[PDB]
Amino acid sequence: QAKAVARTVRIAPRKARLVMDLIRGKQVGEAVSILNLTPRAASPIIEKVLKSAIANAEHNYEMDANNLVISQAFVDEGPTLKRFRPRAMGRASQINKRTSHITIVVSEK
Template sequence: MGKPSHQRRLPENEAQAVVRSLRVSPQKLNLVAGLIRGKKVDRALAELEFSEKRIAGDVRKCVMSAVANAENNHSLDVNDLIVAEAFVGKNLVMKRFHARGRGRGAPILKPFSQLTVIVRQVEEDKADKKKPSKKAAKTTSRKPAAKAASDEAAATSKEAK
C-alpha cells in the first residue's frame, strides 16, 4: 500500500534543503544566511567558501544539498538557480551550569538552530532586462532649465505675432 503522496508545498521552479541541529546560535547563523540571500548559487558558494565564520562550511553544505535536490529531484537547471530564501529557526537549547563562588551556579546556554535554504530557477532573459537607470530616465524626460525657458519664450513670441 504505502503512504499517499503529499502535494508539493513549493512551486515547480523551487527546491529546498533543511539542516537541523546546527550547534550555533540563531543570531550568528542568520548573519551567515544574510550573506547568501538573493544571490546566484555559484556566487553564494564562493562567498561561503572564503568566509571566516565557523558555521559557513555547514551553510555551504546546505546550499549544495538544495542545488542537488533541484537538479536530481526536480530537473532544474543548476546554472539558473538563485538562493531565493535562507531563513533560520530556533532548535533545542542545552542547559548547563558553571560553578561559582559560595556554592552558587551560573547558567550556560548552548543553543542549536536550524537552517532552511530555498533555491529558485530564474530565466536569464528576465534577469538581463533591468529597469533603465535613473540617469538615463532623467536625461530623456527633462530639458535643461535654460533650454526650456528659451523654448517657452519662443512659443510665446510666435503666439504674439
Template sequence: MQVKAINRFVRMSAFKLRDVARSIQGMPAEQALAVLAHYPKEGARHIRRTLASALANAENNHSLHRGDLFVKEALIGEAATIKRFQPKARGSAGPIRKRTSHIRIVLEQKEEK
C-alpha cells in the same frame, strides 16, 4: 519551481548564523557557494553544506540546471537549547545555554521572459 533543504539542530546560535545567511540571499546559487567557501566565519561552513544539499536536490530530484537557480530564502531559526550548569563561588551554580539552530535554504529557478 522551488527547491529546499533543511539542516536541523546545528550546534551554533542563530545570531551567529544569520549574519552569514543575509549575505547570500538573492545571489545566484553558484556564486553563493563560491562566496561561502571564502567567508571568514565558521557558520559559513554549515550554510554551505545546506546550500550544496539544496543544489543536489534540485539536480537529482527535479532535473534543474545549477546555473538557473538563485537563493530565494536563507532562513535561520532557533532550535532547542541544551541547558548545563557550571559551579560558581560559594556553592552556587551558573547556567550555560548551548544554543542550536535550524537552517532552511530555498532555491528558485530564474524565470525566462
C-alpha cells in the same frame, strides 16, 4: 522550487544569522564562493546545506545549475541544551548551548 533544512545543527542561531544574511537573494554559483571564502563558524554548515539544496536535482525534479538563485532562506531556533557552569561562591551560573534550524529555498531565474 527546491528546499533543504538542517534540523538542529549545533550552532548558535545569532552566529548563524550574522553570516547567513549576506548570501540572501544572490546567485548561488557565486554565493557559495562568497561564503566558502568568508571565514566564520557557521560557513561550512551553511555551504553544506546549500550544496544539498542545489544537489536536489539528480534524483529529483530537474533543474539546471546555471540560471539558479537562492529564493529565500532564514534561520530558526531549535531546542537548547541547558548547562550549569560552576562559578565563585557556589553561585552555579547557567549557560545556554543553543541549537539552530538552517533552511534554504532555491528557485530559478
